[PDB]
Structure formats: structure tokens, C-alpha cells
Amino acid sequence: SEESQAFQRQLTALIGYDVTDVSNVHDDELEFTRRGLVTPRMAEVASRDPKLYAMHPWVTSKPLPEYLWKKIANNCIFIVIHRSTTSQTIKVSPDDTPGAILQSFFTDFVLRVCGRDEYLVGETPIKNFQWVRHCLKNGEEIHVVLDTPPDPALDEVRKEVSLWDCDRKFRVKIRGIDIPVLDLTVFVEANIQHGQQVLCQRRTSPKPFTEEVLWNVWLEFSIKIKDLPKGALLNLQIYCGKVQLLYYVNLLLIDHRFLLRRGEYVLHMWQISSFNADKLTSATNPDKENSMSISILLDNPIALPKHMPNQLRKQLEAIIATDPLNPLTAEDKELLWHFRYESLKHPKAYPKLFSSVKWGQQEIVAKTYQLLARREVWDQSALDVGLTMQLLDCNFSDENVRAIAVQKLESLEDDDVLHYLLQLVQAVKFEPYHDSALARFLLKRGLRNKRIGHFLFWFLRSEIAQSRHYQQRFAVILEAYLRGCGTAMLHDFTQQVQVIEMLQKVTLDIKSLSADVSSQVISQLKQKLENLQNSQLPESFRVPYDPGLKAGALAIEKCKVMASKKKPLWLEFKCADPTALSNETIGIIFKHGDDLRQDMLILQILRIMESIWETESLDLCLLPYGCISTGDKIGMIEIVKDATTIAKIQQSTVGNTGAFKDEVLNHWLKEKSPTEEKFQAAVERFVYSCAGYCVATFVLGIGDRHNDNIMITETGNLFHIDFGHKERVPFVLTPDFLFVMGTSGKKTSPHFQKFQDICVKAYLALRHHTNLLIILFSMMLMTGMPQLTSKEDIEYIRDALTVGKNEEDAKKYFLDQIEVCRDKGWTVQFNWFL
Numbered sequence: 001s002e003e004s005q006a007f008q009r010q011l012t013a014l015i016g017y018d019v020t021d022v023s024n025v026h027d028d029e030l031e032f033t034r035r036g037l038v039t040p041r042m043a044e045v046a047s048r049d050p051k052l053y054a055m056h057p058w059v060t061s062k063p064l065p066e067y068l069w070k071k072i073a074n075n076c077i078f079i080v081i082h083r084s085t086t087s088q089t090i091k092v093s094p095d096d097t098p099g100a101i102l103q104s105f106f107t108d109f110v111l112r113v114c115g116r117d118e119y120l121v122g123e124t125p126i127k128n129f130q131w132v133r134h135c136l137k138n139g140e141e142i143h144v145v146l147d148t149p150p151d152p153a154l155d156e157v158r159k160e161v162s163l164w165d166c167d168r169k170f171r172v173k174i175r176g177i178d179i180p181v182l183d184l185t186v187f188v189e190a191n192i193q194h195g196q197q198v199l200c201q202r203r204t205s206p207k208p209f210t211e212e213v214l215w216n217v218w219l220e221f222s223i224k225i226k227d228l229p230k231g232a233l234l235n236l237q238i239y240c241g242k243v244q245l246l247y248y249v250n251l252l253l254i255d256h257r258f259l260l261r262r263g264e265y266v267l268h269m270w271q272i273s274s275f276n277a278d279k280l281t282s283a284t285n286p287d288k289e290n291s292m293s294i295s296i297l298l299d300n301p302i303a304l305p306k307h308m309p310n311q312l313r314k315q316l317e318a319i320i321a322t323d324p325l326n327p328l329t330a331e332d333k334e335l336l337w338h339f340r341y342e343s344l345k346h347p348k349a350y351p352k353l354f355s356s357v358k359w360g361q362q363e364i365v366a367k368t369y370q371l372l373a374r375r376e377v378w379d380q381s382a383l384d385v386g387l388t389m390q391l392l393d394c395n396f397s398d399e400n401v402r403a404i405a406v407q408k409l410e411s412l413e414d415d416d417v418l419h420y421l422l423q424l425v426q427a428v429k430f431e432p433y434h435d436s437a438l439a440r441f442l443l444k445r446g447l448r449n450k451r452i453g454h455f456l457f458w459f460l461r462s463e464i465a466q467s468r469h470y471q472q473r474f475a476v477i478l479e480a481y482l483r484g485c486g487t488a489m490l491h492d493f494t495q496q497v498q499v500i501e502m503l504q505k506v507t508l509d510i511k512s513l514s515a516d517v518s519s520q521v522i523s524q525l526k527q528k529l530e531n532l533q534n535s536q537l538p539e540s541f542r543v544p545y546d547p548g549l550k551a552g553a554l555a556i557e558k559c560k561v562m563a564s565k566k567k568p569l570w571l572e573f574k575c576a577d578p579t580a581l582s583n584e585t586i587g588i589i590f591k592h593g594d595d596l597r598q599d600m601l602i603l604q605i606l607r608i609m610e611s612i613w614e615t616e617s618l619d620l621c622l623l624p625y626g627c628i629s630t631g632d633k634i635g636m637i638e639i640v641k642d643a644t645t646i647a648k649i650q651q652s653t654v655g656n657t658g659a660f661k662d663e664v665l666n667h668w669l670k671e672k673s674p675t676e677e678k679f680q681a682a683v684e685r686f687v688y689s690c691a692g693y694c695v696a697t698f699v700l701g702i703g704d705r706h707n708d709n710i711m712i713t714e715t716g717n718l719f720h721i722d723f724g725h726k727e728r729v730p731f732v733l734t735p736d737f738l739f740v741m742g743t744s745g746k747k748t749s750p751h752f753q754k755f756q757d758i759c760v761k762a763y764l765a766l767r768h769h770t771n772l773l774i775i776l777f778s779m780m781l782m783t784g785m786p787q788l789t790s791k792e793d794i795e796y797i798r799d800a801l802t803v804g805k806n807e808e809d810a811k812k813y814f815l816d817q818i819e820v821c822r823d824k825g826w827t828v829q830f831n832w833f834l
């Protein structure tokens, strides 16, 4: 109907890509994927409890850490409950279920966290609600309101010849290449591929490079048609010449219906700007009028069916015992495959084991599926995310192998999904087909949970906007999601897209008026911001990086354009919630010109490090602020309240010179403390903050930073910013940081001795997750950071995390690192000036 068509116009606007479109396809896969996702969509929409879905109790089921236990008033917490305005505080024990606390009060209505769309409902103890764990973390009082539970009717949705019996060698005709606009010899290269593994390869003869080049030649491969494994790609590449890769493109050999690929294809190609997610894509270049294209012929009803010695033991164990960046040699691979069944008893052998399979060999693949048919130990094992992630990366392309990882993901609690969601979304870039267990998993987990679903939207939306390589796929996943989240959430997303689009318009305009930063330009900002205040910016919108917060009208006076050379918008909003117990504005930086996905990744890895540290009862008070990529080169950043940079603290005392002074920071910290209890706690928070950032930035290899890119709160919380962008330094430990701790150049201190004692505990704790961090780091680089995609860059983290080396020796490596920051002093900061 037409009702279905205005709604399609709406979905398209929410995604920021026209799904129904067919200008950039060469088959029906994306359309097949839309239909195939209807079932998982509906099966989740129908089965989800409408009551718990409307209130999304953000609950964890982890042990409440040792650091938050011994910060309690004897198994009792104070919850302040609010009627109209006035309130009654109630004593409550960590085990008191929410519905039972209502009985404790009444001596149906629901509890909603004052100021937020966050509910304390369902059958979990209150110590298992993240909001509560946050209040304790930041030593604060749990304020809640007696509210009427939201109507689940708002969540309602608008109801809508066998291949193995073929011994032919694989051939492909290269008709030629056409380039609209342009002397050096050119050739086409053709690969049969599975993952990264090039199974078989063929070049053509080099011809003179002109607007059109024709070959009309058959390329016979040595691989047989029956040996082609599902997921196999034809990778066509074009070099010229000591040569250079110019354009590349890919084609699935076995399509989504299990059929061998036949007929004519006129594929549009991508240009090189090297492990890249993009280099694996089944998508062809949309830019018809500017791009190179290859023309090919396939002629081969062909569908695929659906079917020890002590030293060796030691050699095998040592192979299982290595990191995921250690290259397996031929001896290793031949050993793993032979001792296949021993290797299946060890969950950690799996990544290595399935990297030992020869996929260009039908009967070996068959044997591998028999091996998966008998995977009892894997199916029973206690889930490791690091092992699971390893099997969803680029090294694996077999749908069944990848499906054993997704299987393990099914058992993740919703809280743990949010922790890994970003990388899981990125992991979709390694799936051969648009419809996969993983896609379905994300699809349903987002549909089951309003929070996961919120972030899924922005994660996918972000990729759709700044990746031609995967927009089509993600777009199909997002449409499938939005068709299930419900009119309630669809309307939230709408307002949010409305706001960021309006803001971008203002940003683009203001950027043009500048060159440094004027003050009359700020008047033109405040001008156009008022122009939007009535028509037609919606009263209130959810904050993309913090979906609990509803932001209302702008604080126009407080809005400015930043001193940066990409002119970000410093913005502040009223909180739209009348029940909000404060008057603090919501501070958002709105930035155009940088692709923020990179900052997203680092900050997410930072949250992972936190949760890792929670398992070891540590807490290092990092500030991984909100950061959402919302469009093509636009996003928003959470402004951390009461925070100034290190550089500005120097730029104010010493002056705009550069002759830095040690004392300045401690004095700065003292001028901001009401008591000595509030100064030492502030110094204490600096002891962790700094130690947290020191460790983390060193492992990630982003430690060496300009001191204007490090900020501090007035409560002692140090934190790095702007992960967007000669002799070296590991991290940033300056004589002013060391002053706060006590040291004066070459001494020790009551706190400094604790600094190293917290750093090492932190460094070694991350080291217990070497595998996970390695795979996170690599996926970060492969899917999010194309500027640094060499093997040299990934092998940094092997050195940084000191693989193989035992604990005590690695401790000494880290202690040496701190003792390089002592040696270097200020020669780091100083050198940036010119």
C-alpha cells in the first residue's frame, strides 16, 4: 500500500541509505537477505516480554567487586524515593529485589531513576543494577521516583547437478577493463580465495594501459569446481608497471543459494588510496561515472550439497600455547591437522586448528565438518570472548567455523554484549554472505534489548554513512532491526536524526565564516541556534552516547565554537526531564571534519580494559566519555564536567611560553579542594587515573601525547582525549604528575611506590587477557584504521604486552618504562612547539 511506502521513505531517512535500490547490485542477495531476516525479526518481536522490553532494566549478574563491597554501610544502602517533590529515604539491603522494596515503602507503580529513562524492575537484586553500581562507584545517593510504568502498546510494530560431482577446472574469461577518464603496462590478476588464504592464482599478459583494454582470454585455474568451498571469492585485481596495485574487486563463487556463479558480469572497482576489511567486500563500487570496471564471463544448474609421542605432545602444546599473531608454519599446520582429535579436546587449539585446514580440497573440508559434528568439549566449555573473537575475524570465512563462535555468543548476558557490540558489528565486515548467524545474533539481541538496539542503530548508521564498502549490508541489517524496535523507538531515532542534521547544517555554515576563531562568529552561531529553537527542532531528544538522558532546549548563551582548527561546536542543553534532581546542563561537542569511528574504537577498548580490571578487583578510574559517530565525518562527544587540560594549567601560571613548572598542578588541585579530605581523595584519584591511562595508552601504543590532549577534573580524575591524530617516549608521566605523587626528579614517595604497585597490577591483569587484547587491537586496525594497516603496526602489541615472557620479567619491563619517563622529563612536551 501507500501506507507501506511513506513508511519506506521514513526507514530510508533513518538509515541514510535507500535499501530498495538496485543500481549497485549484480544479483539478488541483499533482497534475499531482507526476506530471510523476517523470521528472526518476528521470532524475537513475538517472544520478547513486552513489560521488560519497555523498561529495559540495565542489569548485570557479575560479582560486585571487592572495591565496591568495602565501600558500604554494613549491608545497607540509602535509596531516596520521591512522590511529587518531597521524599522519604529508605534503608535497603543489597539483596532486596525492586518489587519487594515497593512493599517496604507501601508499609501498580514502578521505580524510575531520577532524571533518566532507567527503571529498577524485574527479578534481580538491586546490587545487580548498573545504575546502583555506578552510584557507589562515584560515591553518590540513589535517587528514584514512584512512576507509572510505560505502556507496552507503544512498542507495537506494524504487522507485515551436484557441485561435488564435477571435475572441471575453474575458468574465467577476462573480457577487458574500462576506465572512463585517464602510458604504463597493465595486467589483471585473478584469485580464488578463502579468507586471506589465496588458494590458486592467475595473471594475464601485460597490455598497454589506455581508457579501454581487451584480452578476451580464458584463465584456467588449477583448482577443480568440486574443490571450491562455500564462501570462496573470485578476487580480481589490476596492477601496472616493480609494480603497484591499482583497483580491486571481488565476486562470491558460490552464491547465497549454494549455486556456482555463472554468466556475464560488469563489476565496478575500488581504487587504492595491507590488511583491510574493505579489501574483502562483495560490494561493487557505486560510483559508476568515475570508476574502473572489469568485464568477465563464467561458464562452468550446479549446486553445493549440505554434508602420541612425548615430544610431539609437547610440540603440539607449544603451538596451542602461542598468541594469535604468531604465524603457524607448514610443520605446525601439518601437525595440528594430523593430531586433529587431540586438538579438539583443547578449546584454545581451535583458531590454530581451523587455520590448518586446506580449504581448496573437498575431502579435507568434509573431514573438517565431521570434526565440527563431534565438538562436545567446545559446546560445554566456559565461554572466552578472546577465543570467540578470534573465530569471527578475517582469518576465518567458513560459515560453520564462524557459527561455532556465534554459538558461544548466544550465552552472553546483555551487559556483556554492550561491552563487545562495536567489534561484533565490525566483525560483520568479515562475513562472506550478507545473511549470517552473527548478523542474526546482533539483529535479535538488539531487538530483545532497547539499549543494545539503540547503540546498534548508531553503530550501523555510522558505518552506512562512511563506508561505500559495507553500506549495503549494514543497511539491510538496520532495516531489519528498525522493522522490529517499534513505533516508540522509531520516533526516538527520528528526533535524534532530526537534531544531528540540523546541527550539521549550522556547523558547515560556521566553518565557512572562519579562516583563528573570531568572537563575532560566535554571535552568528548563537543567531542560527535560536533560529532552530522553535522551528523545527523537537522539544527533547535522547543523547546518542547516553540513551538514558533526554536533552531539551539549548543553553544558547553557553554555546561556542571551539579554538580548534576544525571548528567544533561546544554545545550545552537543558535536561528535558522535570524530575531531574540537578540543574547541570548536558555538554556536547559537535564535530565535523574527522571520522570519529576511530575514537569510538579506542574508547570502547578502554571500557573493555575497565571490565577486565573489575575481574581482578582493580579499578583505575578511566574516563571513557561518550563518543558517537553519527554521519559522514560528523559525530558528538560528551563534555566531561569540571575538567581542564594540562596545557592550559601551564598556559595560565607560567604563561604562553614553554618553560614548564612542576609545582603548578598540585597547587591547581589544591585551589579546587574544599577540605583536605577532598584534596587527598583528589590526589588519590590522580594516582589511579594516571596509572590507568599510563598502562592503557602504552598497550594501545597511543601513550606519547601532547599534554593539551590530556585533561583533568577538579576532583583529581586525569583522562586523555582526542584519539583522532624525532626521539620517542612510551607514555606521558611528567614531573608535574610526579609532583602530585611526591617525587622531585630522582626520589621515591609514599604514593609513587603505590603508583608502580597499581600500574604493574594493571599491566599484568591485561596480560592475563593477552589473546583478547591482541585480537581487539588487530580488528581495530583492520576495520577502523586504514592509515596504519601493515604487519609492522600490529606486531607492536606483541612487544608492548611482552608475550611469552613470564610475569616477573614483564613487571621489570614495565618498571623500566616508567624509568624512561623519569629520564626524559619535559623534552617530550617541549619538542612539539615547532
Ligand SMILES: COc1ccc(Nc2ncc(CN3CCN(S(C)(=O)=O)CC3)cc2-c2nc(C)nc(N)n2)cn1
Pocket: 560, 561, 562, 563, 564, 568, 570, 589, 591, 594, 599, 625, 637, 638, 639, 640, 641, 643, 644, 645, 711, 721, 722, 723, 724
Ligand atoms: C575527537 O575530536 C575531539 C574534539 C574535542 C575533544 N575534547 C576536547 N578537546 C579540546 C579541549 C580543549 N578546549 C580548547 C578550546 N577551548 S574553547 C576556548 O574553544 O572553548 C575549550 C577547551 C577540551 C576537550 C574536552 N573533551 C572532553 C571529552 N571533555 C572536556 N571537558 N573537554 C575530544 N575529541
